[PDB]
Subunit: 151 residues, 3 copies
């Protein structure tokens, strides 16, 4: 019978954690995070070249923003808009020009290219930036763009 | 057979979670948050006009700072003093001049107006700012003040 | 008896809570925090004199960064390098010149002094700063350095 009461104790401890944490989730994401589905985008608030931004995300236990649906892209757009700085996405066509892939090598399952993009301008645009309007444009990886990671 | 080996593992998990969560809360509130009662104030660290600041909070699942007691005002004041930037509160008298209300329309249940305030200076101050001294002053909503939301 | 579905139900709750907490924790640390062992470092992103920095950390429920091993020092270094600003540690030799101690009074169990340090330059360097290279240097407590607390 002590076990039933033992379960009764846990239930109360779990309810408290659930309630307290739900409040902190909101506090934490304000103002540099955006939750969408089971994914969370978090911006560093500063700009870095692709290779550097990529390293920051992976070392933090995540990866560069990789919107895989319209919902995710719009969520990401909210941050870019708020910071008013275009950001880098994780995908590139550095291995096979014309073929963009996620850091894993998988082909894109979603894309929101601005009209005429990607266009490998100047013959050297292998990274992707997302504008404040939410559209994508392949851009030189050496450029500095807002760092946004997904977790 | 009444193994209860499950209750054991659960107890350990919850205990660790309580410790980990408590540590996490401290980390989150440092340095832009303040916990008072069941409420949590958090500043974005930058300034914005009222409408913009108000949107940021509501979109984040909260609302602009709304101190309803001396204790809450004191907590909010700590943040304002830290950033050394007056911050917008949620209350306005935009609907009926000379009558300030919370975003819900309710009448103020607490106030800490500086001497002579609110004075609708220039006949156009319908928003409220809290100075570093903790006192309130009605100010033009178009001015840019520290964004502090409550959750 | 039928307590199996309850304890089994809690398993799901606690584990779902553990997964969400795990994700929000990674989000929380990017980009101003670093986890090492059971300790967490988090920078305020700005500089303050020692006394002010120490008060901020204590009032937040923690203390100034106190690397007690090469691993912890390396973790702290990442934050310093990221902000490109030397940070204050919690240790001082205010009590007895030449003898650095943690806030508790305990002698150092680890140190990473740069060559020639600590030298008590000017006859008044009782605080400690960590350079972007990870090496330590005693410096005047009245100087302003990056604020990094540990929790
Ligand atoms: O939403 N926005 O804020 C938003 C802002 C600017 C923008 O676009 C405006 O600037 C971008 C560059 O930044 C121009 O992009 C142009 O140059 C880029 C780099 O040389 C090329 O990668 C791109 O393919 C080409 O169209 C675009 O032709 C122009 O119309 C589109 C959208
Ligand atoms: O605590 N503080 O840090 C703290 C700082 C300044 C302050 O007050 C000082 O500046 C404020 C404006 O910012 C002045 O406020 C003056 O102009 C404002 C519009 O700009 C009016 O809404 C206000 O009613 C009027 O008194 C005040 O007369 C002056 O004495 C009061 C307190
Ligand atoms: O890794 N780093 O980024 C990194 C940056 C600077 C540095 O060192 C350079 O500046 C520091 C001061 O900041 C100098 O430090 C000098 O003045 C300090 C007080 O201002 C004294 O506490 C120190 O004992 C003395 O050597 C050092 O002699 C010089 O070589 C060493 C390392
Ligand atoms: Ca190419
Ligand atoms: Ca290309
Ligand atoms: Ca392009
Ligand atoms: Ca009015
Ligand atoms: Ca008014
Ligand atoms: Ca006024
Ligand atoms: Ca001394
Ligand atoms: Ca000394
Ligand atoms: Ca020195």
């Amino acid at each position: 019978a002590s076990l039933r009461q033992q379960v009764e104790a846990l239930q109360g401890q779990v309810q408290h954690l659930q309630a307290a944490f739900s409040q902190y989730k909101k506090v934490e994401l304000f103002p540099n995070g955006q939750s969408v589905g089971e994914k969370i985008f978090k911006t560093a608030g500063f700009v870095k070249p692709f290779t550097e931004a990529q390293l920051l995300c992976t070392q933090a236990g995540g990866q560069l923003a990789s919107p895989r649906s319209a919902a995710e892209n719009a969520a990401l757009q909210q941050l870019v808009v708020a910071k008013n700085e275009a950001a880098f996405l994780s995908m590139t066509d550095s291995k096979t020009e014309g073929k963009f892939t996620y850091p894993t090598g998988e082909s894109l399952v979603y894309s929101n290219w601005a009209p005429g993009e990607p266009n490998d301008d100047g013959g050297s645009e292998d990274c992707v930036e997302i504008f404040t309007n939410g559209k994508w444009n392949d851009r030189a990886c050496g450029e500095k763009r807002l760092v946004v990671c997904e977790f």
